[PDB]
Write a protein that binds this ligand. Structure first.
Ligand code: MG
Ligand code: MG
Ligand code: MG
Ligand code: MG
Ligand code: MG
Ligand code: MG
Ligand code: MG
Ligand code: MG
Ligand code: MG
Ligand code: MG
Ligand code: MG
Ligand code: MG
Lengths: 142, 283, 58, 48, 46, 141, 6, 161
RNA sequence: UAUACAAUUAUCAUAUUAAAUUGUUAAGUGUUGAUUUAACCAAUAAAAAUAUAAAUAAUUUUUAUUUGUUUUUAAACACCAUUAGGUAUAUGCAAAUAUAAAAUUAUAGUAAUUAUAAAUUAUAUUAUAUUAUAUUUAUUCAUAUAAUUAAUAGGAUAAUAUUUGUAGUUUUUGAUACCAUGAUAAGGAUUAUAAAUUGAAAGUGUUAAUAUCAUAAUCAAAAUUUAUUAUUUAUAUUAAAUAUGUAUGUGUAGAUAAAAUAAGAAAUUAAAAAGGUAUUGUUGCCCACCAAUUUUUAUAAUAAAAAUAACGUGCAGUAAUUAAUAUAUUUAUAAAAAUAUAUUUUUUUUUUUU
């Protein structure tokens, strides 16, 4: 890769813009996971049946010391709002916290409550060249 | 300069000395140049043209047991029509060379016949013997053609030659029959050809072809015979020899006789010469 | 012809070399040895071509 | 050529070389081997 | 092709190179040959 | 294949900015969601333009004859209950059976986005005058 | 041409 | 195979025959195929036909165009003949004339220096064997009539100065 | 330190038997104005044609005579300077390649040589037949993450093993996040039709002798800046792994892509002559001024000459970016440049009365 954002920058090649078979791209990057729909609200990026049980990740499975963030496929439950306990999720740069609890979240997965690609951009994680290219696309002011 | 270094390979039970100096080079400005060729037992004998010097009982056994090579060549070329062989351009080339082998002597004799005004009476045993001896000396390589020719024209004939020539010739050009009859006679009496007729035929034929040429019986003295610089084999005088956007890249793809067949290291997509991609239906 | 004209069962498409070779080194049997004696257009049987044989049989 | 050596069974460039049997030769067994018959080992297990 | 001019039409191998010569053009109408032969012969006598 | 340049460090106080921005993006999304649900339901509940294309048959026919007779006397109540939404309208026509095989085959219907216009729509421009602040997938007025 | 030596 | 025959094939690099050392590159220009001075087969025809076209449009004469296309039909074979004969000339010229680029050029004045020398020598012995390569001073456009009595009005021999 | 040119043909400065010298011809006004030049500027434009014979050959002209410098512009061209002007071609002075010589340089003590020519160096409009580029369709192109690579060990139907439960820390250092040679890609431009392929060697991350900073590797659910990518465009539109909310705008700039192959397209081609101060050869060599120093002397703005490897100008030369070479005269940061003559150690272009 051109820039190494992780270790894998060293190991992987891009291969230009290369086509992969349908719904298998090596890296699952869900840009769409928060993509508003009123009519599809309960069917989009959620369980295919409402009679399914909540995933593994809503439960404490073993003897734990504690966790840092809960997984993002965990589904937001009335207790998430009510209990007033830390609810963290791993997003980038670091972690997203649900601080301001609402019932409107309930019954959806935190995938869906966390905007993956923010309209906010750090100018300090960008090279002067990259900043130029972000000004061309009409994102950054200059 | 980050100059690349190559460590010498020493001879090994599978990697003998000559294999090493020929297939491996320690100087890497000489890599990726091109292929070199060498010859082995028979192809070496062809290229080097080593005349066999005569020897003991085996060599005369094989001078007497030889038979007609003019014919054997012909047979071997023909034999390519056999079910288990192909017809070769090489086999043909060998036949051709044996048939057309008679230009060195036949050419010379053509010159003595047609290139000389007034070579005396060529039936007389004197001049006849001159010609005979010189011929046998052009064959068996004992003399240069040029030297034997200048020998022939400077040979001793008869006192006051020109002034006896004024009693026969006007412009000093004699008749050419005696010359050709003698020149055929000599090749017959000497053992020059295996089959008797060939001598006369060739000596005749080569003259008939030159008859049509502009200033036919004159020759530039430098090109007339062996000299440092020569004419191309087509122009020698009495000689016997007188898609499309991709086919750089298709260079292997027809029906190609090979020498070395290509190999998968050197050829990425080629399938081989025998292959038919677009076959028709045949009963 | 690139290679001798012989029933192709005698040839093998070489590995690693673009060329065919003979699966019996250099021996060659002519077409005549595939068919019965004096077989019309060397043929298992003279009456019909392959397809003719099939549908006659059917 | 490499730090990983060729494995002589799967490589045709070993198998079909001049030091082994080419695929166009006649493929029969070379010599028979009687090992177990000539000198036989008595059974002793590692486990009792 | 690529940033370079197209080859002239004659620089490609023949478009119909794989079609036999008896197909281009087809000589059909053989049925009539004999007919017209007789006809012409007849006319001569007339 | 060049060695990948190292990525610059993240930013100072950008963790706070990202937290806040996502936080109130979500808070905003609650009202965007509330509002688009309101819109979706308001659309389902309100009337639409007639789904059938009158340029073809059996629909071109004068409103006093044929299919329109069949509609005024037998189907009217139902057609109004479903508010001329194009899906239930087409289904009702299949179930009235007095047209029968024609509904899909001979009859033509307006395209999706036109059929979705509010009843009363006069100019075509209306398709583009609906609210873009709301996430209904064109199911909003 | 003048600068060619570099 | 091309060593010792220094001329290479034909239509090929170093195939050109030489005449007193300078190569023969004009062959087609000789037989008048493809030259500016090139021989023209039919003129009277083409002129006749052109006249016909220019005169009037009421009558159209294809008779002229028939005489002309006849003429052309012959011209083709004529030209192939001339070309063939010319290639035979190239062959003959190579055999019996050309030196194969082995003799010194005769075609530029310095090659003839010795000749000019012979002339300079003469003008020197006329001058009492003195001024070699010397020539009279060029005077003026009208030196004779612009000069007064007592000065040389015409250019003298160099020794005479 | 002494120790044997040539004398048949040798290019820079010591000439020598030679007939010349003298000729008064030509050309010039009608009228309203873009000539010459690659480009500038001054500003009437037309013109100067004739002489052979004869002169005897050699022996004391060498302080004698002689080798393109020239009055008159009130006459031009031309050249030089730039609108002002200069100059505009053998009456003074002036020996000088046409070879009499002994290795290069150098005023005749300097450095150790120099000079030289044919090997090699891709484009200068030479010819029918073996048969066609001027058609069609395209162009909004984005996607990577949460560190420990080092060894063997067999079980039922077996003539007997607790070997059920096999237990000896600790001296080495590279493929790593890091310098650490090799090897396969892509890229149509003239071996054609018959029984036949429209994909190439000149090398595109992962591979074998240079080590001497660091555990960075996917087992899910994740963060767009990257030249190198054919997406669904208006009757009906989210059900199983979770699967994309955005750009309706007169098929509309510039610029671009693809194809003669079971498809269907039909008429505007190339060959043959050429130079090297370099020597795997133009990314080659070289030239002067401009500093230090070394050394000889016949000390001219600032002595001359020879060694020489800095710095700074340039680009003089190798037919070399207005061809070079020699003489002459002028000019000047420096190679050098302008003009007047000769000349090829410069490459050639060729009417036997039209
Ligand atoms: Mg040449
Ligand atoms: Mg002298
Ligand atoms: Mg490589
Ligand atoms: Mg690991
Ligand atoms: Mg000194
Ligand atoms: Mg000095
Ligand atoms: Mg220069
Ligand atoms: Mg110059
Ligand atoms: Mg120059
Ligand atoms: Mg000069
Ligand atoms: Mg200067
Ligand atoms: Mg000068």
């Amino acid at each position: 890769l051109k820039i190494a954002k992780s270790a894998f920058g060293f190991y992987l090649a891009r291969r230009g813009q290369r086509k992969y078979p349908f719904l298998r791209r090596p890296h699952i990057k869900n840009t769409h996971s928060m993509n508003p729909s009123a009519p599809y609200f309960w069917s989009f990026m959620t369980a295919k049946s409402q009679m399914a049980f909540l995933p593994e990740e809503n439960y404490i499975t073993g003897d734990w010391t504690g966790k840092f963030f809960v997984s993002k496929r965990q589904v937001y439950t009335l207790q998430h709002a009510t209990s007033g306990a830390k609810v963290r999720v791993k997003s980038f740069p670091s972690i997203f916290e649900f601080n301001s609890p609402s019932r409107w979240n309930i019954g959806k997965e935190m995938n869906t409550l966390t905007k993956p690609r923010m309209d906010l951009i750090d100018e300090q994680m960008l090279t002067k060249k990259q900043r130029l290219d972000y000004v061309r696309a009409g994102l950054l002011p200059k | 300069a980050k100059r690349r270094v190559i460590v010498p390979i020493h001879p090994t039970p599978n990697f003998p000395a000559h294999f090493i100096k020929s297939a491996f080079t320690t100087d890497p400005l000489k890599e990726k140049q091109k292929a070199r060729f060498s010859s082995g037992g028979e192809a070496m004998r062809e290229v080097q043209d080593i005349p066999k010097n005569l020897e003991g009982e085996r060599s005369r056994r094989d001078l007497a047991s030889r038979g007609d090579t003019e014919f054997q060549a012909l047979v071997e070329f023909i034999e390519g029509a056999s079910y288990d062989q192909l017809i070769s351009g090489r086999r043909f080339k060998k036949v051709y060379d044996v048939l057309s082998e008679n230009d060195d002597m036949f050419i010379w004799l053509c010159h003595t016949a047609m290139s000389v005004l007034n070579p005396g009476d060529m039936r007389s045993r004197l001049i006849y013997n001159h010609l005979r001896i010189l011929a046998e000396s052009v064959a068996s390589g004992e003399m240069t053609q040029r030297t034997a020719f200048r020998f022939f024209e400077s040979a001793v004939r008869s006192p006051a030659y020109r002034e006896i020539a004024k009693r026969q010739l006007e412009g000093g050009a004699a008749t050419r029959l005696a010359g050709i009859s003698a020149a055929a006679d000599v090749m017959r009496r000497m053992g020059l050809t295996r089959r008797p007729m060939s001598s006369y035929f060739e000596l005749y034929q080569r003259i008939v072809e030159r008859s049509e040429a502009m200033t036919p019986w004159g020759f530039p003295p430098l090109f007339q015979f062996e000299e440092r610089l020569s004419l191309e084999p087509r122009l020698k005088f009495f000689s016997r020899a007188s898609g499309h956007v991709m086919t750089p890249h298709t260079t292997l793809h027809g029906r190609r006789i090979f020498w070395i067949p290509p190999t998968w290291n050197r050829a990425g997509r080629f399938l081989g010469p025998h292959v038919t991609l677009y076959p028709g239906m045949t009963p | 012809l690139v290679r001798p004209d012989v029933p192709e069962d005698q040839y093998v498409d070489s590995w690693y070399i673009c060329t065919s070779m003979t699966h019996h080194m250099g021996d060659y049997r002519p077409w005549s040895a595939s068919a019965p004696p004096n077989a019309f257009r060397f043929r298992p049987f003279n009456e019909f071509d392959a397809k003719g044989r099939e549908y006659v049989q059917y | 050529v490499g730090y990983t050596p060729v494995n002589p069974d799967t490589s045709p460039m070993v198998a079909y070389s001049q030091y082994h049997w080419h695929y166009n030769l006649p493929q029969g067994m070379e010599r028979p081997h009687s090992v177990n018959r000539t000198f036989a080992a008595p059974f002793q297990s590692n486990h009792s | 092709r690529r940033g370079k001019p197209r080859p002239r039409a004659g620089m490609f191998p023949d478009k119909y190179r794989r079609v036999p010569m008896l197909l281009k053009p087809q000589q059909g109408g053989q049925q009539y040959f004999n007919h017209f032969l007789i006809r012409s012969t007849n006319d001569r006598l007339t | 294949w060049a060695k990948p340049k190292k990525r610059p460090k993240v930013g100072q106080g950008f963790h706070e900015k990202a937290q806040k921005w996502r936080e109130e993006y979500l808070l905003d999304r609650h009202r965007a969601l509330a509002d688009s649900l309101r819109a979706y339901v308001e659309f389902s509940t309100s009337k639409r333009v007639e789904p059938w294309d009158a340029r073809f048959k059996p629909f071109d026919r004068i409103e006093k004859d044929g299919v329109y007779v069949l509609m005024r006397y037998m189907m009217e109540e139902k057609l109004q209950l479903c508010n001329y939404h194009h899906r239930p309208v087409k289904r009702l026509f299949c179930n009235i059976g007095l047209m029968g095989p024609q509904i899909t085959t001979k009859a033509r219907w307006k395209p999706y986005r036109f059929a979705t216009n509010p009843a009363g729509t006069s100019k075509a421009e209306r398709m583009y005058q609906r609210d873009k602040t709301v996430y209904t997938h064109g199911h909003n007025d | 041409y003048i600068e060619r030596g570099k | 195979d091309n060593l010792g025959v220094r001329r290479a094939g034909r239509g090929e690099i170093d195939s050109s025959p030489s005449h007193s050392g300078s190569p023969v590159f004009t062959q087609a220009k000789l037989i008048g195929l493809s030259g500016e001075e090139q021989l023209t087969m039919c003129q009277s025809e083409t002129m006749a036909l052109r006249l016909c076209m220019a005169k009037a449009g009421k009558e159209t004469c294809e008779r002229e165009s028939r005489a002309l296309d006849s003429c052309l039909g012959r011209v083709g074979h004529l030209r192939r003949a001339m070309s063939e004969a010319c290639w035979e000339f190239n062959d003959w010229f190579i055999q019996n004339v050309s030196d194969n680029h082995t003799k010194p050029f005769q075609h530029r004045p310095h090659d003839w220096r010795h000749f000019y020398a012979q002339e300079k020598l003469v003008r020197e012995r006329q001058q009492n064997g003195h001024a070699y390569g010397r020539r009279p001073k060029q005077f003026s456009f009208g030196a004779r009539y612009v000069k007064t009595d007592g000065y040389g009005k015409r250019p003298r021999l160099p020794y005479n100065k």
